[PDB]
Design a protein around this motif. Structure first.
Motif, PDB file in Angstrom:
ATOM      1  N   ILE A   7       1.058  -1.158  -0.002  1.00 37.88           N
ATOM      2  CA  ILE A   7       0.067  -0.081   0.237  1.00 37.88           C
ATOM      3  C   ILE A   7       0.701   1.199  -0.057  1.00 37.88           C
ATOM      4  O   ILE A   7       1.608   1.555   0.720  1.00 37.88           O
ATOM      5  N   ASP A  78      -3.313   2.866  -2.840  1.00 38.56           N
ATOM      6  CA  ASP A  78      -3.479   1.942  -3.605  1.00 38.56           C
ATOM      7  C   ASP A  78      -2.590   0.500  -3.444  1.00 38.56           C
ATOM      8  O   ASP A  78      -1.742   0.660  -2.576  1.00 38.56           O
ATOM      9  N   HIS A 206     -13.368   4.806  -2.113  1.00 37.70           N
ATOM     10  CA  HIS A 206     -14.101   3.602  -2.450  1.00 37.70           C
ATOM     11  C   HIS A 206     -15.557   3.944  -2.621  1.00 37.70           C
ATOM     12  O   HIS A 206     -16.528   3.458  -1.623  1.00 37.70           O
TER      13      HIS A 206
ATOM     14  N   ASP B 159     -11.124  -3.753   4.903  1.00 38.20           N
ATOM     15  CA  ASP B 159     -10.537  -2.643   4.307  1.00 38.20           C
ATOM     16  C   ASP B 159      -8.905  -3.155   4.103  1.00 38.20           C
ATOM     17  O   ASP B 159      -8.686  -2.933   3.026  1.00 38.20           O
ATOM     18  N   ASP B 162      -9.179  -5.533   1.943  1.00 35.06           N
ATOM     19  CA  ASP B 162      -9.412  -4.969   0.613  1.00 35.06           C
ATOM     20  C   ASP B 162     -10.103  -5.796  -0.332  1.00 35.06           C
ATOM     21  O   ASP B 162      -9.359  -6.576  -1.267  1.00 35.06           O
ATOM     22  N   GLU B 164     -12.225  -5.029  -2.961  1.00 37.76           N
ATOM     23  CA  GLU B 164     -12.697  -3.654  -4.256  1.00 37.76           C
ATOM     24  C   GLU B 164     -13.672  -4.564  -5.174  1.00 37.76           C
ATOM     25  O   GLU B 164     -13.259  -5.240  -5.940  1.00 37.76           O
TER      26      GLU B 164
END
Ligand SMILES: Nc1ncnc2c1ncn2[C@@H]1O[C@H](COP(=O)(O)OP(=O)(O)O)[C@@H](O)[C@H]1O
Ligand SMILES: Nc1ncnc2c1ncn2[C@@H]1O[C@H](COP(=O)(O)OP(=O)(O)O)[C@@H](O)[C@H]1O
Ligand SMILES: Nc1ncnc2c1ncn2[C@@H]1O[C@H](COP(=O)(O)OP(=O)(O)O)[C@@H](O)[C@H]1O
Lengths: 723, 474
Positions: A7, A78, A206, B159, B162, B164
């Protein structure tokens, strides 16, 4: 889930070609102190950098400045894919070109001014397509690597040849200018950025999550702070850093538009900000439009405010935006905007502190060639009441000074000045001196929050008390699990007392540095200022700006002042209580016991204080701070001479036996007196400098004893029942 | 919505209202609920302007405008009586009023169960716990609390993991759990920033927390329990019930615990006007507020309007010595007007306490006001034993520790004093378990070391003072 996927978090090493990772992480990927890495991100792009070890870095992240981040086409948070790359061999030919919109103005040898000192035996691992940034010459220029012989990537070794086709390239669409705003452009505002981030994180990064989660994302963020703080700057950098769309609404901008066209622009604005969402509609001077207070007079005025409230709620929620706003203070705005659903979240951005101002200056000089004699810190240390902007203009009037001398007297009239010249131009600590020296320091100054710039090294003796302080503040916060184990509730605050000049204040500050908390000093005269003006209403305003800054230590000096004022000894027909002291009791009692604000009240006159402040629930603990003993005195001298020209032959333990009825203040006096002789010397001979013995012994001539034996005993008898 | 109609162009405003009402009559039965009423009808001094004025009138003509034939009900909301315009109170428009003050203990708890009835709460989660620490929290302040409390348990679980998607999976969200540790973080934020105003509640204390003083306990019920649970008798003889009592005696003997405990008994609301607030009014010459109080107490009956340090205003202005003037003063005076005014037949009982009976305006002791004078002396050998137990009930009491013993060690002590000696033992225990690690049950060697710094708030001089004051005062 592949320990090669990290990240992207901000960087600690600003270098364009560096990506820091924790030491334990580099062992899982097997990379050493220089292993050239190959980074892969979204929009199908790559980049090459040098890996390092960073302790403050978590295994779940990879630090990388914005150049890196941008070239990958990623935003903080990201996921990217690292990879060792020990096959990249020294390059041969490198073709880089400047970008028209970062050169308009400078001319000449770009290869000499920027490129050359940049790679100067740096062995920078670049790539075909990258866009690095070089600073110098009071500006920043962006170059895009067009072609590298060992394509696509190679290391820049002192041999590799370099081209500069001297024909600037246009900026490509998906290439955000590194010229814009970002978190690297904000200084001293840490605790704040922290909050603001997690707030807009999920919603602006998000969206989808909320398309399924039944949780409402704070809609409105309000930014406090006086003019200059840099409320706006932050708000923009938030958006540029999350890729979110940014629509700016100036206050007088909409209050300048004809009656009717006003409700048009707002509606029109919001509507258009919903179209490009995610977005941050940031209102500038909110108070100029919505101050619906007593000041609410007129039709236009009223209707305008309503127009907003209907738009603030108007956020269909379906819509996907965040309305950030700014103002000079709570009381400026209109209460209707606080309604849980509009501007429910608030962030204060008070003035900068020591480390702050310093951090800022490094940001506004990170483009000019500073001189060796330049002491950036020095400046930060003398700009007590300086906002963000006051510091920026400072560097401008500080560089413009180093200009009206160098190339100006040399004078280089042109349609466009040369770049070699500007890179040679240097700004000296002497030019900054001139800046401060101007009337420019006129940066408004109000009540000040900060961090204690002092430690326990500045406090001579009084060790028994030192630990005691931690027992009232350190234990209740670093072990709250225990305080519940027995049930008893932690004391709300302490009350130091004793003779004047014994460190009752140094203690209050030092203990706050220990807990790394904010320090808030309400000094006697301010208590009186309220008392005389019958404005004890302000008291409440205080406890708030303290609560709006936990952890903190709300400290009250000369708490007795109001008493001495009204008379103290004799006084009048009345009793102990008075209007200011009373209000502080309401707030000290009110103030949630479960917050993180510790009160410390000091007084060199315990014998006149309203006995209600000593009641339990308020200032329970009473701590006596007596004058310094034979031991403490020796350590006090050292503590007050630490940063001074102490001669060797000078005897400290000796003076500790010369003085007795002295307090830290007294000893300190004797010190400067020695120095007021030393400076009287070096300034005399010229028209050789190390403070010596014959100075002190001559400084004992005018030696006093602030604490008289009568009073000495007074505190013995007061500290009898008081104890 | 309020600003909704006050946002519309002048003229189109009177249009929406008329237009609204008309359309609400068409689908009747109905409730036309005006949100921010005060932003449209505050016709007060603040009434400046044509549009402003005409808008308010437009409503009054529509409030009455309810042809009655029509079949609707107009509900409205505001921040307070003084916000609105008096014309709206006219018997025929907004004649009925309902107050919905902040939530109390049980309230906040009841609320939280409503805003978590959808998320998977963790075992360690103590919903009650929270309700018990959110003293000044409104409804919304609690909701956002759970949101910032769940969003926290999110920026960690799925989170960091993750997932997505254009849409997250449901199996995942059902696995996600919010822990008491995530809530802790919520409160910990600046979010608790709700409001804190004149707080009404119910006494969270019983008689189990009051050591000794049993003779008085029953006496209290004789002044409040009988007049409400047997009003048929009080008429049998004719005599009218006393309006209120006045506790007095040394500081820290439960004069307050009594006032609260008796209100819990009668399951009534508790309203505490503490000394400093009396002074706050006194200094600001705003004794007008006094009236505001007695109201929020009549609009909350049953209730016990309790006045602490009722002597404050006296000590302030001098007390002992004082000035050329008398016992009366502006704040105390106003409370007499309201205490006399206040309908004898309501359900509001006044309790005034003071650790200085010798300076009170003798007018408050007149019949019709605070008739009964009750003296609360320091604790005896017996009471002391029960006080320790009452103040150690929820604590790590070791077994070997002797209570009856200390009851013979202390004499001139008051509940407050004994309590002090207690925490001092604990300020040693926590100083222990914190020192070893870097095992926890408060023992004997703690107390005996806590007797070192043992005081005696009530000095024998004063001791006697209350003996001589309680001679004629009784
Ligand atoms: N904390 C800061 N860090 C970096 N620059 C700052 C800071 N504060 C102020 N500045 C500088 O001063 C200007 C103040 O900008 P702005 O956001 O408009 O402040 P405000 O909201 O108080 O009007 C900025 O453009 C910036 O260059
Ligand atoms: N314990 C100490 N150790 C070192 N210096 C001291 C000490 N006490 C006082 N001083 C010196 O004397 C000054 C008195 O400081 P201050 O704590 O504000 O006084 P007080 O709180 O007693 O009014 C300090 O600025 C410091 O330079
Ligand atoms: N009778 C008692 N029984 C148990 N605890 C007491 C008693 N009296 C005083 N205390 C303790 O001392 C504190 C003093 O309370 P309070 O009723 O407010 O005193 P006062 O009204 O006489 O000023 C209480 O909160 C409690 O912890």
């Amino acid at each position: 889930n592949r320990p090669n996927r990290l990240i992207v978090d901000e960087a600690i090493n600003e270098d364009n070609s560096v990506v820091s990772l924790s030491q334990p992480k580099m062992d899982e990927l097997q990379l050493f102190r220089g292993d050239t890495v190959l980074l892969k991100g979204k929009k199908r792009r790559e980049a090459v950098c040098i890996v390092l070890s960073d302790d403050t870095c978590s295994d779940e992240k990879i630090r990388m400045n914005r150049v890196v981040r941008n070239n990958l086409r990623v935003r903080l948070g990201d996921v990217i894919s690292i990879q060792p790359c020990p096959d990249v061999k020294y390059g041969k030919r490198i073709h880089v070109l400047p970008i028209d919109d970062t050169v308009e103005g400078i001319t000449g040898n770009l290869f000499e001014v920027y490129l050359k000192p940049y790679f100067l035996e740096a062995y920078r691992p670049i790539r075909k397509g990258d866009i690095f940034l070089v600073r110098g010459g009071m500006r920043a220029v962006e170059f895009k690597v067009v072609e590298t012989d060992p394509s696509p990537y190679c290391i820049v070794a002192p041999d590799t040849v370099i081209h500069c086709e001297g024909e600037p390239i246009k900026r490509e669409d998906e290439e955000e200018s590194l010229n814009e705003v970002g978190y690297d452009d904000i200084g001293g505002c840490r605790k704040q950025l922290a909050q603001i981030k997690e707030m807009v994180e999920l919603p602006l990064r998000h969206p989808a999550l909320f398309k399924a989660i039944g949780v409402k994302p704070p809609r409105g963020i309000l930014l406090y702070g006086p003019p200059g703080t840099g409320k706006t700057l932050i708000a923009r950098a938030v958006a540029n850093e999350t890729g979110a769309f940014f629509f700016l609404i100036n206050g007088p901008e909409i209050m300048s538009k004809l009656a009717g066209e006003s409700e048009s622009n707002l509606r029109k604005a919001f509507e258009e900000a919903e179209k490009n969402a995610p977005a941050i509609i940031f209102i500038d001077e909110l108070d100029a439009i919505a101050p619906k207070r007593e000041k609410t007079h007129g039709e236009v005025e009223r209707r305008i405010v309503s127009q907003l409230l209907t738009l603030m709620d108007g956020l269909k929620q379906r819509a996907h935006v965040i309305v950030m706003a700014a103002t000079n203070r709570p009381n400026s705005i209109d209460p209707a905007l606080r309604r849980f659903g509009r501007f429910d979240r608030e962030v204060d951005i008070g003035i900068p502190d020591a480390t702050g101002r310093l951090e800022i200056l490094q940001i506004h000089t990170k483009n000019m060639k500073l001189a060796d004699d330049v002491d950036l810190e020095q400046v930060a240390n003398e700009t007590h009441g300086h906002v963000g902007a006051d510091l920026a203009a400072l560097c401008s009037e500080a560089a413009l000074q180093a200009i009206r001398k160098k190339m100006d007297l040399i004078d280089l009239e042109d349609e466009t000045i040369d770049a070699e010249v500007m890179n040679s131009l240097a700004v000296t600590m002497d030019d900054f001196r001139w800046a401060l020296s101007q009337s420019n320091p006129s940066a408004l100054r109000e009540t000040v929050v900060e961090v204690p710039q002092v430690t326990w090294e500045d406090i001579g003796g009084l060790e028994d008390v030192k630990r005691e302080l931690q027992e009232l503040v350190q234990y209740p916060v670093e072990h709250p699990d225990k305080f519940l184990k027995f049930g008893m509730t932690p004391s709300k605050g302490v009350l130091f007392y004793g003779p004047p000049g014994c460190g009752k204040t140094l203690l209050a500050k030092a203990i706050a540095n220990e807990c790394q908390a904010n320090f808030i000093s309400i000094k006697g005269p301010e208590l009186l200022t309220m008392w005389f003006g019958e404005s004890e209403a302000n008291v409440r305003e205080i406890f708030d700006k303290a609560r709006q800054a936990a952890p903190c230590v709300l400290f009250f000096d000369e708490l007795d002042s109001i008493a001495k004022a009204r008379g103290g000894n004799i006084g009048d027909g009345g009793g102990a209580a008075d209007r200011v002291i009373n209000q502080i009791l309401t707030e000290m009692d009110g103030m949630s016991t479960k917050k993180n604000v510790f009160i410390i009240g000091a007084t060199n006159r315990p014998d006149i204080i309203d006995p209600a402040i000593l009641r339990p629930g308020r200032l329970d603990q009473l701590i006596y701070i007596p004058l310094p003993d034979e031991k403490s005195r020796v350590a006090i001298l050292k503590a007050n001479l630490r940063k001074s020209p102490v001669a060797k032959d000078v005897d400290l333990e000796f003076l500790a036996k010369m003085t007795n009825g002295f307090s830290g203040a007294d000893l300190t006096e004797i010190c400067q007196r020695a120095c007021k002789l030393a400076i009287r010397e070096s300034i005399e001979s010229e028209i050789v400098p190390e403070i010596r013995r014959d100075h002190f012994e001559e400084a004992m001539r005018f030696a006093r004893r602030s604490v008289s034996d009568n009073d000495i005993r007074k505190y013995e008898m007061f500290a009898q029942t008081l104890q």
